[PDB]
């Protein structure tokens, strides 16, 4: 039908479209199968430029390696979109769609329709949402348990990096997250927590700074390096020259009038500097002990830097949009734009301001605040890929622990959620459900597909995956009759079951919810498609 219409085209239908979606799914699954879990293998990505970037995140692997298949680009958007808002569960979405297609394809070969199979996944998904309410556990945030946040931070950090980096980088996240909770209980991740690159001694020397760190310092030598008590000032006004909207020549007639008009360039700048001097006169007391610093969002003229250097005022220019939205949280002051209306109330407070330089670059450190509402995480590293590995680790770790404070619940992991849904879907009475007909295998297909995830953790350790679930099955058979509510786990060190409640392995709530919802939608849409084709003008 397509060859007589289009003189050139490609068409697959009714057996190859199903084999393509399953073969491409099994192919992409094998790539990210080994990365899943704590003992998984690392993966570097080097392009033709020659740069190196190292991480285990499936999003970085998918959004850097170009892919030609039409199925995998939907898995790429699904794995990326789930991680872009949640920050965790990337490879879990690929494994579910990677496993649910092959687990249903065996029954498509038997002759079951794709429509009624996907109808079983949807009604089975509603059972999992009802199971999340009973499976989760309530946790009160008023206790302010720091040990509970430490265990959540080690869940994601142990997966990416080893124990040496996890132990030193875990309390860096906990100290940053401990300040997030407040009376308003409004979560703020992007403005409050930041990441900055700095090539320094080693990755292990990452330290926590309570104040806002800046990537610039004092240009002039005579300007002060260290300041004990520095009251900041925010000004978004540009203090260099301005070209003035079509204004043209300073038509000068005589030679004396030439430089007389050139001196007017300083008058516009000096009109704004005098307001700073008038502000300094109000806070002139204890001038050797105290200090003053000005932070500008736009550039400052080098002619005006000597004015600040004479009065021992520290100058910082060309700040980011985000840093201006963070000085009020750290120093406690208020922002200002125009130099007309000033007051001492808007000035912040800082207990220690010092600068340290390496090579050509220079960094400014601010800390020792009275009541800092925000902070930073200055990560140290050796190579560029070391920063990229710490970028993805801190980016995925902050989002995972931040979601625990959003809600009042937390899901235990280590296969407890998948193993619990297996017994629930395989033992629940079907008469309570509304599905009938050939929906018998759809419940078994999706229930059995969840088992492949916790044994993929075992496949990286090298043990037999089927044998380490024998005692797990025998434990739950007696746990229901023993009248003791416990949740089992999968410990890869010894190859035996464990309890995530005491070991500290946990997982966020919206990760597993959005993962199955996004995976079931993608896997269902790929099953119903029975024809592939390419056509268009080019």
């Amino acid at each position: 039908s397509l060859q007589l219409l289009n003189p050139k085209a490609e068409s697959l239908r009714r057996d190859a479209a199903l084999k393509v979606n399953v073969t491409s799914a099994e192919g992409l699954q094998s790539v990210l199968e080994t990365n899943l879990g704590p003992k998984g293998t690392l993966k570097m990505l080097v392009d033709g430029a020659g740069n190196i970037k190292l991480t285990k995140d499936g999003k970085v692997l998918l959004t850097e390696m170009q892919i030609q298949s039409p199925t995998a680009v939907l898995i790429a958007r699904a794995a990326a979109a789930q991680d872009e808002i949640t920050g965790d569960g990337t490879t879990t979405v690929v494994c579910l769609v990677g496993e649910l297609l092959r687990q249903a394809h065996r029954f498509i070969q038997e002759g079951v329709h794709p429509r009624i199979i996907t109808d079983g996944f949807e009604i089975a998904r509603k059972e999992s949402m009802k199971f999340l309410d009973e499976f989760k556990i309530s946790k009160t945030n008023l206790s302010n348990d720091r040990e509970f946040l430490l265990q959540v931070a080690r869940s994601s950090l142990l997966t990416k990096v080893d124990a040496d980096l996890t132990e030193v980088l875990t309390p860096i996240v906990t100290d940053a997250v401990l300040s997030v909770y407040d009376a308003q209980a409004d979560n703020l991740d992007l403005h409050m927590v930041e990441i900055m690159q700095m090539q320094h001694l080693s990755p292990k020397d990452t330290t926590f700074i309570k104040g806002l760190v800046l990537d610039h310092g004092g240009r002039h030598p005579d300007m002060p390096t260290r300041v004990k008590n520095a009251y900041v000032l925010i000004l978004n006004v540009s203090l260099e020259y301005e070209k003035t909207e079509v204004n043209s020549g300073f038509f000068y007639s005589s030679a004396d009038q030439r430089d007389k008009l050139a001196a007017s360039e300083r008058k516009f700048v000096d009109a704004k500097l005098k307001k700073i001097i008038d502000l300094k006169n109000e806070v002139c007391g204890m001038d050797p002990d105290k200090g003053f610093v000005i932070i500008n969002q736009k550039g400052i003229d080098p002619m005006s830097l000597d004015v600040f250097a004479k009065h021992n005022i520290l100058a910082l220019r060309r700040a980011k949009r985000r840093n201006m939205e963070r000085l009020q949280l750290v120093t406690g002051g208020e922002a200002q734009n125009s130099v007309e209306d000033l007051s001492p109330q808007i000035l912040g407070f800082s207990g220690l301001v010092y600068q340290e330089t390496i090579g050509e670059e220079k960094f400014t450190y601010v800390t020792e605040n009275t009541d800092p509402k925000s902070c930073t995480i200055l990560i140290k590293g050796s190579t560029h890929y070391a920063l990229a590995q710490t970028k993805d680790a801190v980016r995925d770790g902050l989002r995972a622990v931040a979601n625990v404070l959003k809600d009042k619940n937390i899901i235990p992991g280590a296969g407890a959620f998948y193993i619990a849904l297996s017994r629930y879907l395989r033992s629940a009475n079907m008469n309570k459900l509304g599905a009938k007909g050939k929906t018998k295998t759809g419940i078994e297909a999706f229930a059995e597909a969840l088992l492949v995830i916790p044994k993929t953790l075992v496949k990286n350790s090298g043990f037999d995956p089927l044998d380490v679930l024998a005692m797990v099955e025998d434990e739950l058979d007696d746990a229901q009759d023993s009248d003791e509510t416990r949740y089992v786990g999968v410990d890869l060190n010894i190859g035996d079951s464990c309890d995530p409640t005491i070991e500290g392995i946990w997982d966020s709530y919206r990760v597993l919810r959005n993962a199955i919802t996004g995976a079931t939608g993608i896997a269902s849409n790929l099953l119903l498609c029975d024809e592939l084709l390419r056509a268009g003008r080019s």
Binding site: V31, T41, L54, M65, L201, F250, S254, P302, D306, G359
Partner: protein, 548 residues
Amino acid sequence: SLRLPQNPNAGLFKQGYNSYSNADGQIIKSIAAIRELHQMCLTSMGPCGRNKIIVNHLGKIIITNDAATMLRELDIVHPAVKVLVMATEQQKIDMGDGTNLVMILAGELLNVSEKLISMGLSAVEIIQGYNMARKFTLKELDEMVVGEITDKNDKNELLKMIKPVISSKKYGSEDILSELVSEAVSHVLPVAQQAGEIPYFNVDSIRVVKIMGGSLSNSTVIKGMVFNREPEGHVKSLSEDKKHKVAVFTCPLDIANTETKGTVLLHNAQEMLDFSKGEEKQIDAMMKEIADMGVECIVAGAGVGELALHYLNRYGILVLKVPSKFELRRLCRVCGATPLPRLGAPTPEELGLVETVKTMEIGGDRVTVFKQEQGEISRTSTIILRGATQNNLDDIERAIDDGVAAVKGLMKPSGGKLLPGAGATEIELISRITKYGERTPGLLQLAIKQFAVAFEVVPRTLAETAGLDVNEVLPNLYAAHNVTEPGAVKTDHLYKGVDIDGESDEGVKDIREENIYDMLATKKFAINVATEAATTVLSIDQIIMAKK
């Protein structure tokens, strides 16, 4: 049968992308890929090390015996080898000392790991083995330390510091090269004894200007600095004592033109007559306030006009060009002047002090000198380095950067904390780490054992490059550390090391009287970054590339 299916489901990725897993002996190949350029480093560590020719696509050649420098120009395909390039680049930037060692160790740790992975040790246990060895290695470096400097400025103490550093890069003669650095270090340091002030030192203070011709013995130590400039108006020997004054201006010595459309406007002939003379009288009037302060040389930051030049050389004011930012900032540190962009009167407190400004022929071209005297000392001194081949000037200049980088190692920590060199610091850790393997149980003992075997490359390399048979020189040195109960209590068997030239057998007559030592701060970060180089290469089990 005639053709395979050629890897089905390969259209998931592009045709140019390739995967490289741990299987198929590819981790052995990555160790072999390190072994290609690692053997190039064997001929380049030590005082008998051989330099390397590197011809770039542009044709710029650099001759060198260091690693961090040679690896910058070579375009590398293997990513695991690039870890060593950036690891040595980190070594050069931070400490500026001990890069051949990083490569040599991070390469031999991968060499002995070739035996461990072949035996069947898991990669996770290998990282735990070297980390536990690293904590014991850095601990024992602080224990077996002997000696300290305790004085920032001394003639004899600096010979113990600079001489073992520059002995690797362009050894040559010892005294003529060491005295140029020890004399220049004393000039720039703020001594200030019995004051309690914090010391301070900058790597950018000491800078070497390359001048062709002459010989290495004719090199002198200049108090000030030098450029290859020409005075515009006139040259002056300046035989007048009673020191001159210095005024630095960052703006050009000309009329400050309007930034927005500076154009003449003359409505009548009365303005036409006075406009030509007005510029002359205006420029002259600005020079009166400058000339009355007693200044005789002004350093300009950009192009100077001819009318301003006519009034400067009238009173004999020298003009100097510095058309860049850093070239103008380095000169203010010598005389201690504070520049101001205005064309007004320099402040008397801000005027600099320079006694003489000579112009002589060194390399056939015109150069201007700013030698100070013993009174009113200055900082940011230079070293006139004379040589025949421009390629040798480049490597000797970076040897001063390594020596100046070694002086930085004294400021931050509490003191010097020197160690015995000539392989003595490496061979001592072999016995201590070997004993540590016997104390710990578990399957990690083989990782601790092979970590000690990797440290044999420093004495094995120095014995191979010295033209001696390593099979006889190495076990002869082990007898000094295998020994017990010998007379003296105050034991002096720690200073035994290899020898490049001389007596047979080789245990050197101590590294003592020889006055060669190593820095603690270099060994700390070198073993740290070398272990990180082996950690990142051994921890990864799959590699993915593109386009090749």
